[PDB]
C-alpha cells in the first residue's frame, strides 16, 4: 500500500506607486 | 511656415522641398484646367 501511495503522489499599478510614497 | 531662425542652409532646403513638392501637384492640376 505504501508503494501505491508514492505512485499516487507522483501522479493595481497605482498600488505600487502608492506604497513607495508612504515609505518616503 | 518655413522656419529660418537657427537652421542651417541644408535644413531650410528640406522644409522648402517638402512644401514645394506637395504644392506642385495641385499647381500642375490648376494650370491644366486653365490650359
Amino acid at each position: 500500500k505504501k508503494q501505491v501511495e508514492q505512485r499516487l503522489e507522483f501522479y493595481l499599478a497605482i498600488q505600487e506607486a502608492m506604497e513607495l510614497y508612504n515609505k518616503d | 511656415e518655413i522656419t529660418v531662425d537657427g537652421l542651417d542652409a541644408n535644413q531650410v532646403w528640406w522644409q522648402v522641398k517638402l512644401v514645394l513638392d506637395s504644392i506642385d501637384g495641385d499647381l500642375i492640376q490648376g494650370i491644366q484646367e486653365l490650359k
Partner: protein, 391 residues
C-alpha cells in the same frame, strides 16, 4: 482596541462598496441616474460633488495610515474609482486638483486620472483635451514640488503616447513648448520627464516640430556633456538613456533635419558609458537604415580623428567599428565610389592606430582584423577608374 475597530470599520465600508442585482450595486444605480434623462441636473451635480469628497476621504487615510488596514483602504479605493464613469470622473476630480491643498493628495489624484485612461479608447478624445488643458495650466503652479511636477509630465507623456495624434493640435504644440522650457530644470527628474515628453510630442508632430528643433537638439547635446561630469548623480543611467531615446525618436521621424547634427548624435552614442551596449548598438542601426549613408561615412572620419582615436575606450572603439562595417555593407555602389577618397583617408588613419593605441597586442590585432575585412568590402563594389588613383 482603537486600531482593531478601524480594521473592522474599513472592512465594513469595503463590504458595502464591494461589487459582489440592479438595486444592490451602487455602480449600476449611478449609471441609471446618468442615463435617466428626467433626472434633475442638480441631482447629478450632487453625485459628482459627493464622489469628490468620497475620493478625497479615502486618499486622506491612505496618505496618512498597519499593513492589513493599508491593503483594505486600497480595496475601498478600488471600489470607489469604479462607481461612476470616465465622463463624470474627470468632471468631478479635475476641479478637485486645484481645491486640494495637500501635496500628497494631489500626487495621488494625478496617478488615478492616468489609470482611468489606460484602458479607454477613442471615445475619450474630447475628455482628454479637457484633461490635458488642466494639466498644462497647473504645471506652472506645481513648479515647487518635484514629485507632482514629474508625475504631471508622466501622465501627459502617456496621454500623448496614446491617441496623441487625435488630440487637438494646439495642446500638442503647447505641450512641446512646455517641455523644452523644463528641460533646463535643475532637478534631474524633471529633465528625464521633459525629455520623454519631447520624444512623444515630436513623434506625433513629425516635421511640424521642426520649428522647435533649435530648442531640442542643441540643449540636449549640452545636457549630455554635463551628464558625464556628474557621475555621482543617482539617476545617471536613466538620464543618459533619456537623451539617447530622444535621438532615437527623432532619428526615425526627422532624419533629413538631424542630418546636419549627426556628428553630435554619434558623440552621444559612443561616450554614453552608463547606457548598456545593447541600447547603444540598437540606436546605431536606426541611423544606418534612416539617415543617408554618404554623410555618415564623411562624419565617421572626423569623429575618429578627433575623439575616438585618442579616447582609449574599448566600448567607444567597438561601437565605431560596428557603425563602419554597417555603412560599408549597406552603402550603394554609386555612393561608395563618390566617397572613396574619404574612406581611404580614414583607412590610412586606422592602419596607423597601432602607433598611438594604448591597448595590448591582441586588441589591436583584433581591431585591425575588422579594419581589413571592411576595406575589402569597400574596395570591392568600385571600378578600376576610381581605384587606380587611390591605389
Amino acid at each position: 482596541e482603537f486600531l482593531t475597530f478601524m480594521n473592522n470599520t474599513f472592512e465594513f465600508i469595503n463590504k458595502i462598496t464591494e461589487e459582489t442585482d440592479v438595486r444592490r450595486n451602487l455602480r449600476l444605480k449611478v449609471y441609471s441616474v446618468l442615463l435617466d434623462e428626467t433626472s434633475d441636473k442638480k441631482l447629478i451635480r450632487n453625485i459628482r460633488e459627493e464622489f469628490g469628497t468620497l475620493l478625497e476621504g479615502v486618499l486622506f487615510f491612505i496618505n496618512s495610515v498597519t499593513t492589513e488596514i493599508k491593503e483594505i483602504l486600497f480595496k475601498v479605493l478600488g471600489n470607489v474609482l469604479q462607481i461612476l464613469p470616465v465622463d463624470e470622473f474627470v468632471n468631478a476630480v479635475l476641479p478637485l486638483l486645484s481645491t486640494s491643498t495637500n501635496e500628497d493628495i494631489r500626487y495621488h489624484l494625478t496617478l488615478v486620472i492616468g489609470s482611468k485612461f489606460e484602458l479607454e479608447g477613442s471615445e475619450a478624445i474630447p475628455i482628454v483635451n479637457n484633461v490635458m488643458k488642466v494639466l498644462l495650466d497647473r504645471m506652472p503652479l506645481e513648479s515647487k514640488s518635484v514629485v507632482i511636477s514629474q508625475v504631471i509630465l508622466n501622465t501627459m507623456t502617456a496621454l500623448v503616447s496614446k491617441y496623441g495624434k487625435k488630440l487637438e493640435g494646439s495642446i500638442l504644440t503647447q505641450a512641446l513648448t512646455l517641455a523644452t522650457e523644463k528641460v533646463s530644470s535643475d532637478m534631474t527628474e524633471v529633465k528625464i520627464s521633459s525629455l520623454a515628453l519631447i520624444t512623444n510630442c515630436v513623434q506625433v508632430l513629425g516635421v511640424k516640430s521642426i520649428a522647435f528643433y533649435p530648442k531640442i537638439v542643441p540643449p540636449s547635446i549640452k545636457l549630455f556633456d554635463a551628464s558625464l561630469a556628474d557621475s555621482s548623480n543617482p539617476l545617471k543611467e536613466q538620464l543618459q538613456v533619456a537623451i539617447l531615446l530622444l535621438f532615437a525618436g527623432l532619428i526615425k521621424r526627422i532624419p533629413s533635419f538631424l542630418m546636419s547634427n549627426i556628428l553630435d548624435v554619434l558623440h552621444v552614442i559612443y561616450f554614453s558609458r552608463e547606457v548598456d551596449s545593447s541600447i547603444r548598438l540598437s540606436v546605431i542601426s536606426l541611423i544606418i537604415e534612416n539617415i543617408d549613408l554618404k554623410e555618415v561615412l564623411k562624419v565617421l572620419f572626423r569623429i575618429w580623428s578627433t575623439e575616438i582615436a585618442t579616447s582609449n575606450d574599448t566600448v567607444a572603439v567597438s561601437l565605431f567599428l560596428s557603425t563602419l562595417e554597417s555603412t560599408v555593407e549597406n552603402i550603394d555602389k554609386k555612393s561608395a565610389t563618390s566617397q572613396s577618397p574619404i574612406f581611404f583617408k580614414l583607412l590610412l588613419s586606422l592602419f596607423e592606430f597601432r602607433s598611438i593605441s594604448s591597448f595590448d597586442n591582441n586588441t589591436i590585432s583584433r581591431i585591425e582584423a575588422s579594419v581589413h575585412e571592411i576595406s575589402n568590402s569597400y574596395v570591392l563594389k568600385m571600378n578600376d577608374k576610381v581605384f587606380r588613383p587611390l591605389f
